[PDB]
């Protein structure tokens, strides 16, 4: 017999992820490159595997909408929520959904798209948002102007509690 988990979390170490588009702001390699950085977070913390697919249906399937895009959740127009993402579980459960009617960047004007990610993808694996101010999974975006990010301890607490920590060292 089999009881439900505990806690939301992926039965799986293997995750496989798709853009299904891109916003207009930033290239496609730039996107590629903050979403495969964001899944680094998390992967670096844990045994979690990312594997992009091009096509077909991944368990976290990012795109960009506005407004009405598919599920209960509407976009807004710009400013007020800028991205929101699915606990882990079947179908929408993973997906994370960018409001393109933010201005996505690869600094610190607009909103960082690879900063924004790594927050979405924490939902995306089970995480909820933190007291800490300091946290990654803060519930709101500052840009802090650290030239290096660096997953806070808060954040790699909370996601090992989840997956544990895979290797320790490399
Ligand atoms: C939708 O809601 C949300 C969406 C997102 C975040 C939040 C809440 N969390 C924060 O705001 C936050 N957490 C941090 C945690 C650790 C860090 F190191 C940080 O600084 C990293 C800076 C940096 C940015 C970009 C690059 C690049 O492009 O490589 C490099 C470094 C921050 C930080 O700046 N902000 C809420
Ligand atoms: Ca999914
Ligand atoms: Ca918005
Ligand atoms: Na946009
Ligand atoms: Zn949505
Ligand atoms: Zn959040």
Do not use: C
């Not at 702001?25 to 990312?50: C, G, I, R, Y």
């Not at 995306?124 to 990010?149: E, R, V, W």
């Not at 996601?159 to 320790?168: A, C, F, V």
């Amino acid at each position: 017999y089999n009881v439900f988990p505990r806690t939301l979390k992926w039965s799986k170490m293997n995750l496989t992820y798709r853009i299904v588009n891109y916003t207009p702001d930033m290239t496609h390699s730039e996107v590629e490159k903050a979403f495969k950085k964001a899944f680094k977070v998390w992967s670096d913390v844990t045994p979690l595997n990312f594997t992009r697919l091009h096509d077909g249906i991944a368990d976290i399937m990012i795109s960009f909408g506005i407004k009405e895009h598919g599920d209960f959740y509407p976009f807004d127009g710009p400013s007020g929520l800028l991205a929101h993402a699915f606990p882990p579980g079947p179908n929408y459960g993973g997906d994370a959904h960018f409001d393109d009617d933010e201005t996505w960047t690869s600094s610190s004007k607009g909103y960082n798209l690879f900063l924004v990610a790594a927050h979405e993808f924490g939902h995306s694996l089970g995480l909820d948002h933190s007291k800490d101010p300091g946290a990654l999974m803060f519930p709101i975006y500052t840009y802090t102007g650290k030239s290096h990010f660096m997953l806070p301890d808060d954040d790699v607490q909370g996601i090992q509690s989840l997956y544990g920590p895979g290797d320790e060292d490399p």
